[PDB]
Amino acid sequence: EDIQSVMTEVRRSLGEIPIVESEIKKEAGELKPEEEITVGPVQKLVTEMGTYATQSALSSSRPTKKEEDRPPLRGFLLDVAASLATTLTKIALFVAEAMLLMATILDVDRISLCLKVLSDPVYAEAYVHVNQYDIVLDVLVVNQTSDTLQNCTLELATLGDLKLVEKPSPLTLAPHDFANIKANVKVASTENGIIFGNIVYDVSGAASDRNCVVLSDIHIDIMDYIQPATCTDAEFRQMWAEFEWENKVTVNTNMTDLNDYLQHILKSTNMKCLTPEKALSGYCGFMAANLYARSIFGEDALANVSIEKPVHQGPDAAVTGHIRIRAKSQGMALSLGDKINLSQKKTSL
Amino acid sequence: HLEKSAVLQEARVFNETPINPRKCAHILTKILYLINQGEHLGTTEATEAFFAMTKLFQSNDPTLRRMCYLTIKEMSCIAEDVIIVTSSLTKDMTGKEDNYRGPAVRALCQITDSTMLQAVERYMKQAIVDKVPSVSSSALVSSLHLLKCSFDVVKRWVNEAQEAASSDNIMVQYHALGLLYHVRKNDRLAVSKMISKFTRHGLKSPFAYCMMIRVASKQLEEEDGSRDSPLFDFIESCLRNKHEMVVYEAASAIVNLPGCSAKELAPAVSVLQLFCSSPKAALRYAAVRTLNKVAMKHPSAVTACNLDLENLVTDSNRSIATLAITTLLKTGSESSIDRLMKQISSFMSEISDEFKVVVVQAISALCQKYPRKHAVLMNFLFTMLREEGGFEYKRAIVDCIISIIEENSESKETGLSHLCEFIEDCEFTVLATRILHLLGQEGPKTNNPSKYIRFIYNRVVLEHEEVRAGAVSALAKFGAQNEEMLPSILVLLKRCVMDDDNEVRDRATFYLNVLEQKQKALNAGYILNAATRQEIFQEQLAAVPEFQGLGPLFKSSPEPVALTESETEYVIRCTKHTFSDHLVFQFDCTNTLNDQTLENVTVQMEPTEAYEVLSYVPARSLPYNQPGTCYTLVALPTEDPTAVACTFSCVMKFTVKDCDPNTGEIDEEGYEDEYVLEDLEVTVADHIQKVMKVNFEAAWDEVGDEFEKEETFTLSTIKTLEEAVGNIVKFLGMHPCERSDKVPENKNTHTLLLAGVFRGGHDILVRSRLLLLDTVTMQVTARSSEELPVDIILASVG
Amino acid sequence: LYTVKAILILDNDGDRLFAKYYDDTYPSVKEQKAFEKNIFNKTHRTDSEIALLEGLTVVYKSSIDLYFYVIGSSYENELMLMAVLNCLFDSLSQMLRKNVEKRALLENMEGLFLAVDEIVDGGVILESDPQQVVHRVAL
């Protein structure tokens, strides 16, 4: 009763906004003491004035919502021993005095009143090896030439967060001879903003050579670059929403369950899914997986992909999950969604 | 700025005689300004002001005469005395400063009272009527506010009154008529003979025409009779002149064609449409929306494309922007063009006269013509909607979603698919609330569980205890129902997905706890949430106890009869009820005139073809527009030849009492007059249940056996049943039979061997062998299980 | 026809230096301002050829200094309605030899006032052409 009185007093003292039905529920408990220990109809009257007041106000009109009522139980809640009590409550769903008080209280009316008051042999073959940061150029120039045939010309350049940086000096195409020409590239510097690389490159026709290869690269992609990276979930969510929204791609379709499939993709991009809730990536799950990664030149990229997941006549051998990609530029970001899309499955490149 | 104070003090200026009209006028002006801008104040001060002002009035200082008018003018339905001038009004009245006179009267009239009303009157009469058009106008306006109050004082004068309204100035002529808006409010008949006056003369004021139109129109809806010539007459009249408004006015209503009028009218209209078609009358926009309605007829529609294309094209003129949406809509569109438009719209919608609002209206229409239906469009639209966006879609969404529900759309899988996805990355929490609520109900009646789950999880995914919360609540209707896999799992899931975060913890715990608390099946349930028709009338009648026999009702009336014709003061509709023993006529009504309440009411009936007359019953009191009951009662003789079909003669008696409806009086005195009471005729269908026989073969013959009367006619000028037919199916209300009913729009021979049972229990049976040789000669039999019916049928059928 | 909700001549600072609610049934100086605000703020010196707000005709105009408002119902044709609105600019212009200005407004109200009552009086337009007036008036 001390608590009850206090509550009433504080309530009176306040009035200026809030929301709780939930609170009501919170004080009550499964059972609890109320009144003397019982005052029956009068007690029904007791429930009626204290609750009615809360209600009277409730009945009144609104500005911003406070919470749309779902007090269905609210109704039982107001109205062998336990069984008897329950029955009494159902029926309901000193006493006279209480009722009168409630009527008097009946608080929209009060609010309204207040308002009123206010108012060639040489064959060169080459491929790229990227061996640890360093994208390194395997070149075979094989000069199966009939001599250290004269060779042309080559030019240096700033590159991206890399710069190409070596040339084996000579320019002979030694006869019938095979050579390893190495280009180190410098892998942390040279900005060139020609995205995805794909920048024109020259090997020149400048000496025992009339032509050569001028090439633009292709073969320079993302899935690799980014490393996994991590976050606190609440903050995350907040952030997730917050981030560069602007890219998404869809997951749907494969060859596997997202157990093996997910693992594969994860490893392929070298990137993070931040946290599980056991709900269950198994029986279905009906799991949305949140992924985060940070790269070599430091972009953080955020995902929520929400996905169906394999399992007999339950669901998942497609997805129809949406991969939501946030990366700062949409252009790389979406492209990433693609890139991953490439990554997603396993087929003839 | 404004403020009262300087002025009240400043009232001592009144004390000077050396003043300039200007000087004072300004001061006067200052007060008026505060007020024109707005002021509020005490009467006392106002009164004072009056006095103070009033005080000044030696002169005819003309200017002075006006200002006061204003001043006074300020006061009219919320005044302060009247009397003071009085003299001054009269002074004008004998006094030729014509000019002035008129303004003053005009103010008075909101302010008025009845005694004082008495005042003007002989003169007044003159005055309204008097001289130069100018003066007269001044007079008129004055009443109207008094009309607010009343005006009937005037009213009375009327047979005599109108005639002066006869006019010779256009402006005036127009004016006369509105007063006639209320005049015609008072009366319809009057118009009609009147119109022939309005109709009679060609008119002056375009303005005058207009009120008539509305009226004229108003009249037309159910039909304004044989508007053919009038309509026509009019039709020119609206149609051309030097004053545009009429043509248009006419145009918008008049279409008429779902397989209907389109004749001249479409061309004329076209002349107009086109003519308007660039903001002549920026009016044109509204019309297409309804005023001039469109939903077309098929070739007709194709023709429409060009005009809409001009607006569609132009993209300008607020009047234009609106026009684009209605025209396009009404006429409808091909898919293809939409496409072009989507881009156009892409730029347009934001502001292009502030396109968004017209568009939201347009959009509201879009949601309606396709509210999740042509879902492909809905999706195309959806993509586009979100896309073209701004943000302003959200508002639209409120409508759109609503539309989808209205259909209760079925390409939801897709529809939903777009919604779900987009909304996710088309944001706004608020939308979610609404949709949630709806979704909340819907669940497993539309399956696709994995997806739906798939979604649901996502919806929650978002933070907000609140966002999260909805997925659970929606779920309750859903869970409970379960779907293509759910109950087991349904049970498994709440477990699999669980949360802390205190009150968020609590939400999980509690729902659980709640769950914990009821047998989940129960849990779900609580939380989630003869002696005919006519016999009834025999009983309904029964609450009364003044009876002199009844019985149980057998059949009731084949037709209720209005016993007082159309819309009469004592409007009566009557219904007649038959029982095995008695017949009651219970009388349904609306003692019409508010003139009257009828009192001392009883109903006379006087009979020709038998009934024993027990009583005439009337209603004790009948006030206006309110059924009350009066009855008249008879006992029905059944075995006599000629004894239950009857016509009874009616006379209404009452003591007639006048009303005050405001607050009445009900007093013992008042005097009778009696008015004719309509006939009641009693039928052979108020009493009968039409049937099929218990034993036709036998019965058929049998009924002959005991019962049978005959009549023969030989038909020599007409060889058709049909006349006969009209009287027989319809009079008796029985079934034509022995598979001997049917006739197409012709037939060689016919028998109705026909059925039902008469009141008092026994039956009345008829065989009509109609025989065509090629004259008709025919055998009508009535056979009956009751004596009174055989004689009767032969008559009754007629 | 007892049809003027108000005729206001408004400043384009959302101010109103004239309003007569010829006819009225809603109130408050505030609400009047508020009502004003939504629409005025929105039209913001800009007007429209036509505008309907509330199913009601809004004929409003702008000058070169002032904003003219009339509120009426879209329930009575433009051409006439405008004609009165036209009448309002024009006569004032000729007679005075000058049309409306903010300046003009500031020096004296009265003339507007004088005119206004004459032309219209409540929800009934007694008149809509200048000339009659012009002779009639002689102030």
From Swiss-Prot, chain A:
Predominantly expressed in the upper one-third of the oxyntic mucosa and in most regions of the pyloric mucosa. Ubiquitously expressed including platelet, liver, heart, spleen, lung and kidney. Disulfide bonds: none annotated. It comes from the Eukaryota. The chain holds residues 470 to 953 of 953 of the full protein. The lineage of its organism: Eukaryota, Metazoa, Chordata, Craniata, Vertebrata. It is found in: Cytoplasm; Golgi apparatus membrane; Cytoplasmic vesicle, COPI-coated vesicle membrane; Cell membrane. Oligomeric complex that consists of at least the alpha, beta, beta', gamma, delta, epsilon and zeta subunits. Interacts with CAPN8. Interacts with SCYL1 and PRKCE. Interacts with COPG1. Interacts with ARF1 (myristoylated); this interaction is required for binding of COPB1 to Golgi membranes. Interacts (via trunk domain) with ARF1 (via switch I region); the interaction is direct. Interacts with KCNK2 (via N-terminus); this interaction increases the channel-mediated whole cell currents and promotes plasma membrane expression of KCNK2. Interacts with STX17. Interacts with TMEM115. The modification N6-acetyllysine is found at K25. This is Coatomer subunit beta. The gene is Copb1.
Curated annotation (Swiss-Prot), chain B:
InterPro entries: ARM-like, ARM-type_fold, Clathrin/coatomer_adapt-like_N, Clathrin_app_Ig-like_sf, Coatomer/calthrin_app_sub_C, Coatomer_g_Cpla, Coatomer_gsu, Coatomer_gsu_app_Ig-like_dom. It is found in: Cytoplasm, Cytosol; Golgi apparatus membrane; Cytoplasmic vesicle, COPI-coated vesicle membrane. GO terms for biological process: establishment of Golgi localization; intracellular protein transport; organelle transport along microtubule; vesicle-mediated transport. Disulfide bonds: none annotated. Keywords: Cytoplasm, Cytoplasmic vesicle, ER-Golgi transport, Golgi apparatus, Membrane, Phosphoprotein, Protein transport, Repeat, Transport. Residues 533-798 are annotated as: Interaction with ZNF289/ARFGAP2. It is a peripheral membrane protein. Coiled coil: none annotated. HEAT repeats lie at residues 44-81, 263-300, 302-335, 336-372. GO terms for molecular function: structural molecule activity. Its main location: cytoplasm. GO terms for cellular component: COPI vesicle coat; cytosol; Golgi membrane. Oligomeric complex that consists of at least the alpha, beta, beta', gamma, delta, epsilon and zeta subunits. Interacts with ZNF289/ARFGAP2 through its C-terminal appendage domain. Interacts with EGFR upon EGF treatment; interaction is essential for regulation of EGF-dependent nuclear transport of EGFR by retrograde trafficking from the Golgi to the ER. The coatomer interacts with KDEL receptors; the interaction is important for retrograde trafficking of KDEL-bearing proteins from the Golgi to the endoplasmic reticulum. Interacts with COPB1. Interacts with TMED10 (via C-terminus). Belongs to the COPG family. This is Coatomer subunit gamma-1. It comes from Mus musculus. The gene is Copg1.
From Swiss-Prot, chain C:
It comes from the Eukaryota. Keywords: Acetylation, Cytoplasm, Cytoplasmic vesicle, ER-Golgi transport, Golgi apparatus, Membrane, Protein transport, Transport. GO terms for biological process: intra-Golgi vesicle-mediated transport; intracellular protein transport; retrograde vesicle-mediated transport, Golgi to endoplasmic reticulum. The keyword Acetylation applies. One of its GO terms (cellular component) is COPI vesicle coat. Its main location: cytoplasm. It is a peripheral membrane protein. It is found in: Cytoplasm; Golgi apparatus membrane; Cytoplasmic vesicle, COPI-coated vesicle membrane. Oligomeric complex that consists of at least the alpha, beta, beta', gamma, delta, epsilon and zeta subunits. Belongs to the adaptor complexes small subunit family. The coatomer is a cytosolic protein complex that binds to dilysine motifs and reversibly associates with Golgi non-clathrin-coated vesicles, which further mediate biosynthetic protein transport from the ER, via the Golgi up to the trans Golgi network. Coatomer complex is required for budding from Golgi membranes, and is essential for the retrograde Golgi-to-ER transport of dilysine-tagged proteins. The zeta subunit may be involved in regulating the coat assembly and, hence, the rate of biosynthetic protein transport due to its association-dissociation properties with the coatomer complex. This is Coatomer subunit zeta-1. It comes from Mus musculus. The gene is Copz1.
